Amino acid sequence: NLPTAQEVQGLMARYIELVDVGDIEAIVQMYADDATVENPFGQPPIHGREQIAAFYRQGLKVRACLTGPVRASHNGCGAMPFRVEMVWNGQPCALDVIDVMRFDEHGRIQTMQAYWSEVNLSV
Amino acid sequence: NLPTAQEVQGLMARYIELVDVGDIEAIVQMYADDATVENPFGQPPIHGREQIAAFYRQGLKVRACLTGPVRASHNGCGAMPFRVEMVWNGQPCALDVIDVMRFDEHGRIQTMQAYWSEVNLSV
Protein backbone atom coordinates (compact mmCIF):
# COMPACT_ATOMS: atom_id res chain seq x y z
CA ASN A 1 0.00 0.00 0.00
CA LEU A 2 0.90 3.73 0.24
CA PRO A 3 4.29 3.83 1.81
CA THR A 4 4.99 4.87 5.35
CA ALA A 5 8.05 7.10 5.81
CA GLN A 6 10.33 4.07 6.33
CA GLU A 7 8.83 2.50 3.20
CA VAL A 8 9.43 5.67 1.16
CA GLN A 9 13.07 5.67 2.32
CA GLY A 10 13.37 2.09 1.12
CA LEU A 11 11.63 2.73 -2.23
CA MET A 12 13.71 5.75 -3.10
CA ALA A 13 16.93 3.98 -2.15
CA ARG A 14 15.86 1.06 -4.36
CA TYR A 15 15.27 3.55 -7.22
CA ILE A 16 18.84 4.76 -6.95
CA GLU A 17 20.13 1.15 -6.90
CA LEU A 18 18.17 0.43 -10.08
CA VAL A 19 19.50 3.55 -11.80
CA ASP A 20 23.01 2.60 -10.75
CA VAL A 21 22.86 -0.79 -12.38
CA GLY A 22 20.81 0.46 -15.29
CA ASP A 23 17.87 -1.95 -15.11
CA ILE A 24 15.42 0.00 -17.27
CA GLU A 25 12.57 -2.49 -16.95
CA ALA A 26 12.89 -2.60 -13.15
CA ILE A 27 12.97 1.21 -12.91
CA VAL A 28 9.89 1.49 -15.09
CA GLN A 29 8.05 -0.99 -12.95
CA MET A 30 8.49 1.29 -9.96
CA TYR A 31 6.34 3.85 -11.66
CA ALA A 32 2.57 3.85 -11.83
CA ASP A 33 1.35 2.96 -15.32
CA ASP A 34 0.32 6.57 -16.01
CA ALA A 35 3.04 8.29 -13.86
CA THR A 36 4.48 11.60 -14.83
CA VAL A 37 8.15 12.65 -14.80
CA GLU A 38 9.47 16.16 -14.92
CA ASN A 39 13.32 15.84 -15.54
CA PRO A 40 14.74 18.51 -15.20
CA PHE A 41 11.94 20.22 -13.34
CA GLY A 42 11.02 23.07 -15.64
CA GLN A 43 10.62 20.84 -18.70
CA PRO A 44 7.29 19.51 -20.11
CA PRO A 45 6.38 16.32 -18.35
CA ILE A 46 6.54 12.92 -19.77
CA HIS A 47 3.53 10.63 -19.21
CA GLY A 48 3.23 6.88 -18.86
CA ARG A 49 5.45 3.96 -18.69
CA GLU A 50 6.26 3.81 -22.39
CA GLN A 51 7.56 7.37 -22.44
CA ILE A 52 9.31 6.88 -19.09
CA ALA A 53 11.07 3.73 -20.43
CA ALA A 54 12.21 5.73 -23.45
CA PHE A 55 13.56 8.46 -21.27
CA TYR A 56 15.60 6.01 -19.10
CA ARG A 57 16.75 4.02 -22.18
CA GLN A 58 18.13 7.23 -23.69
CA GLY A 59 19.76 8.34 -20.38
CA LEU A 60 20.91 4.82 -19.47
CA LYS A 61 28.29 3.00 -17.96
CA VAL A 62 26.40 5.15 -15.44
CA ARG A 63 26.71 5.18 -11.72
CA ALA A 64 24.31 6.71 -9.26
CA CYS A 65 24.81 7.15 -5.54
CA LEU A 66 22.86 8.79 -2.77
CA THR A 67 24.83 11.73 -1.44
CA GLY A 68 22.72 12.09 1.67
CA PRO A 69 19.77 10.43 3.39
CA VAL A 70 16.33 10.14 1.87
CA ARG A 71 13.94 12.66 3.41
CA ALA A 72 10.54 11.09 3.69
CA SER A 73 7.18 12.55 4.70
CA HIS A 74 4.14 10.99 6.28
CA ASN A 75 2.07 11.40 3.18
CA GLY A 76 3.73 9.14 0.70
CA CYS A 77 6.37 11.60 -0.53
CA GLY A 78 10.02 11.90 -0.31
CA ALA A 79 13.07 13.76 -1.53
CA MET A 80 16.66 12.69 -1.96
CA PRO A 81 20.00 14.07 -3.12
CA PHE A 82 22.22 12.01 -5.38
CA ARG A 83 24.92 12.15 -7.91
CA VAL A 84 24.91 10.48 -11.37
CA GLU A 85 28.26 9.85 -13.07
CA MET A 86 28.26 9.28 -16.81
CA VAL A 87 30.35 9.65 -19.96
CA TRP A 88 29.50 12.30 -22.48
CA ASN A 89 31.56 12.35 -25.67
CA GLY A 90 34.31 10.37 -23.94
CA GLN A 91 34.38 12.75 -20.99
CA PRO A 92 33.42 11.60 -17.52
CA CYS A 93 30.94 13.99 -16.01
CA ALA A 94 28.79 14.09 -12.92
CA LEU A 95 25.40 15.59 -12.25
CA ASP A 96 24.07 16.49 -8.82
CA VAL A 97 20.29 16.06 -8.60
CA ILE A 98 17.46 16.08 -6.09
CA ASP A 99 14.41 14.05 -6.93
CA VAL A 100 11.07 14.51 -5.27
CA MET A 101 8.67 11.60 -5.62
CA ARG A 102 5.04 11.12 -4.73
CA PHE A 103 3.97 7.50 -4.31
CA ASP A 104 0.44 6.14 -4.76
CA GLU A 105 -1.40 3.66 -2.57
CA HIS A 106 0.40 0.69 -4.16
CA GLY A 107 3.85 2.02 -3.48
CA ARG A 108 4.38 3.10 -7.14
CA ILE A 109 5.75 6.49 -8.18
CA GLN A 110 2.91 8.61 -9.35
CA THR A 111 4.92 11.77 -9.91
CA MET A 112 8.61 12.52 -10.07
CA GLN A 113 10.23 15.95 -10.20
CA ALA A 114 14.02 16.12 -10.77
CA TYR A 115 15.70 19.34 -9.71
CA TRP A 116 18.99 20.24 -11.41
CA SER A 117 20.38 22.51 -14.03
CA GLU A 118 23.62 22.97 -15.91
CA VAL A 119 25.14 24.58 -12.72
CA ASN A 120 24.92 21.03 -11.28
CA LEU A 121 27.04 19.38 -13.97
CA SER A 122 30.78 18.78 -13.49
CA VAL A 123 32.84 17.76 -16.54
CA ASN B 1 13.31 39.94 -10.60
CA LEU B 2 12.48 36.20 -10.90
CA PRO B 3 15.73 34.45 -10.29
CA THR B 4 17.80 32.73 -12.88
CA ALA B 5 19.27 29.35 -11.84
CA GLN B 6 22.44 31.10 -10.57
CA GLU B 7 20.27 33.55 -8.65
CA VAL B 8 18.28 30.71 -7.06
CA GLN B 9 21.53 29.07 -5.91
CA GLY B 10 22.54 32.37 -4.32
CA LEU B 11 19.13 32.98 -2.67
CA MET B 12 18.82 29.50 -1.22
CA ALA B 13 22.35 29.63 0.06
CA ARG B 14 21.57 32.97 1.67
CA TYR B 15 18.55 31.38 3.33
CA ILE B 16 20.75 28.79 5.00
CA GLU B 17 23.14 31.49 6.17
CA LEU B 18 20.28 33.39 7.76
CA VAL B 19 18.89 30.29 9.45
CA ASP B 20 22.45 29.49 10.69
CA VAL B 21 22.80 32.84 12.41
CA GLY B 22 19.14 32.95 13.40
CA ASP B 23 18.17 36.33 11.96
CA ILE B 24 14.39 35.93 12.03
CA GLU B 25 13.60 39.27 10.53
CA ALA B 26 16.00 38.74 7.63
CA ILE B 27 14.55 35.28 6.99
CA VAL B 28 10.99 36.57 6.95
CA GLN B 29 11.99 39.28 4.48
CA MET B 30 13.05 36.59 2.02
CA TYR B 31 9.48 35.40 1.81
CA ALA B 32 6.73 37.02 -0.19
CA ASP B 33 4.30 38.82 2.13
CA ASP B 34 1.69 36.09 1.55
CA ALA B 35 4.02 33.09 1.14
CA THR B 36 3.13 29.62 2.29
CA VAL B 37 5.35 27.21 4.18
CA GLU B 38 4.75 23.51 4.56
CA ASN B 39 7.31 22.27 7.31
CA PRO B 40 7.45 19.26 7.51
CA PHE B 41 5.84 18.65 4.17
CA GLY B 42 2.66 16.74 5.04
CA GLN B 43 1.48 19.17 7.69
CA PRO B 44 -1.05 22.05 7.06
CA PRO B 45 0.51 25.13 5.46
CA ILE B 46 1.25 28.30 7.20
CA HIS B 47 0.43 31.55 5.48
CA GLY B 48 1.94 34.96 5.46
CA ARG B 49 4.91 36.67 7.00
CA GLU B 50 3.38 36.98 10.50
CA GLN B 51 2.83 33.23 10.83
CA ILE B 52 6.14 32.47 9.13
CA ALA B 53 7.94 34.77 11.66
CA ALA B 54 6.21 32.98 14.50
CA PHE B 55 7.34 29.67 13.04
CA TYR B 56 10.99 30.70 12.84
CA ARG B 57 10.91 32.41 16.24
CA GLN B 58 9.71 29.14 17.79
CA GLY B 59 12.19 26.92 15.83
CA LEU B 60 14.95 29.54 16.33
CA LYS B 61 21.87 27.92 19.56
CA VAL B 62 21.10 26.48 16.11
CA ARG B 63 23.47 25.75 13.29
CA ALA B 64 22.52 25.06 9.66
CA CYS B 65 24.85 23.84 6.92
CA LEU B 66 24.21 22.93 3.31
CA THR B 67 25.22 19.28 2.94
CA GLY B 68 25.36 19.45 -0.81
CA PRO B 69 24.89 21.87 -3.66
CA VAL B 70 21.74 23.81 -4.35
CA ARG B 71 19.86 22.28 -7.31
CA ALA B 72 18.18 25.09 -9.22
CA SER B 73 15.87 25.00 -12.18
CA HIS B 74 15.16 27.52 -14.94
CA ASN B 75 11.72 28.30 -13.69
CA GLY B 76 12.53 30.02 -10.44
CA CYS B 77 12.58 26.91 -8.27
CA GLY B 78 15.28 25.10 -6.39
CA ALA B 79 15.94 22.33 -3.91
CA MET B 80 18.71 21.92 -1.38
CA PRO B 81 19.86 19.45 1.23
CA PHE B 82 21.02 20.66 4.60
CA ARG B 83 21.41 19.76 8.18
CA VAL B 84 20.16 21.74 11.19
CA GLU B 85 21.86 21.19 14.59
CA MET B 86 19.98 22.21 17.68
CA VAL B 87 19.57 21.43 21.38
CA TRP B 88 16.47 19.62 22.51
CA ASN B 89 16.07 19.25 26.29
CA GLY B 90 19.84 19.80 26.64
CA GLN B 91 20.55 17.05 24.10
CA PRO B 92 22.31 18.09 20.88
CA CYS B 93 20.42 16.71 17.92
CA ALA B 94 20.57 17.10 14.17
CA LEU B 95 17.89 17.05 11.51
CA ASP B 96 18.51 16.34 7.83
CA VAL B 97 16.17 18.28 5.59
CA ILE B 98 15.52 19.04 1.93
CA ASP B 99 13.75 22.28 1.18
CA VAL B 100 12.09 22.99 -2.16
CA MET B 101 11.37 26.64 -2.87
CA ARG B 102 9.54 28.47 -5.53
CA PHE B 103 10.49 32.11 -6.04
CA ASP B 104 8.32 34.84 -7.48
CA GLU B 105 9.07 37.53 -9.90
CA HIS B 106 10.76 39.74 -7.25
CA GLY B 107 13.01 36.99 -6.04
CA ARG B 108 10.98 36.28 -2.89
CA ILE B 109 10.01 32.81 -1.70
CA GLN B 110 6.44 32.24 -2.68
CA THR B 111 6.17 28.64 -1.47
CA MET B 112 8.60 26.49 0.71
CA GLN B 113 8.09 22.72 1.19
CA ALA B 114 10.42 21.06 3.76
CA TYR B 115 10.94 17.35 3.46
CA TRP B 116 11.88 15.39 6.56
CA SER B 117 10.43 13.15 9.17
CA GLU B 118 11.44 11.64 12.45
CA VAL B 119 13.59 9.17 10.43
CA ASN B 120 15.87 12.22 9.70
CA LEU B 121 16.51 13.19 13.32
CA SER B 122 19.67 12.14 15.16
CA VAL B 123 19.73 12.71 18.94
Numbering used by the authors:
A (entry chain B), B (entry chain A): 2 to 61, 65 to 127
From the paper:
We have systematically dissected the potential contribution to catalysis from electrostatic complementarity in ketosteroid isomerase. We first describe KSI, an enzyme suggested to provide electrostatic complementarity to the transition state via oxyanion hole hydrogen bonds. Phenolates, analogs of the transition state and reaction intermediate, bind and accept two hydrogen bonds in an active site oxyanion hole.
Further characterization of KSI via X-ray crystallography, NMR, and isothermal titration calorimetry (ITC) was more readily carried out with one or the other enzyme: pKSI for obtaining a high-resolution crystal structure and for calorimetry and tKSI for NMR spectroscopy. (A) Electron density map (1.5 σ) shows that phenolate is bound at the oxyanion hole, receiving short hydrogen bonds from Tyr16 and Asp103. Results with several spectroscopic techniques confirmed that the anionic phenolate form of the ligand, with a negatively charged oxygen, was bound rather than the unionized phenol form. (B) For phenolate, the average angles are 15° and 47°. The ability of KSI to bind phenolate ions in a mode analogous to its reaction intermediate and transition states provided an exceptional opportunity to isolate the electrostatic behavior of the KSI oxyanion hole and thereby evaluate the energetic contribution from electrostatic transition state complementarity. a, observed with enzymes from two different sources and by two independent binding assays, suggests that electrostatic complementarity in the oxyanion hole provides at most a modest catalytic contribution of ˜300-fold. The results herein indicate that hydrogen bonding in the active site of KSI provides little electrostatic advantage compared with water. In summary, electrostatic and geometrical complementarity may each play modest roles in catalysis by KSI, and there may be additional contributions from better accommodation of the steroid ring geometry in the transition state than in the ground state.
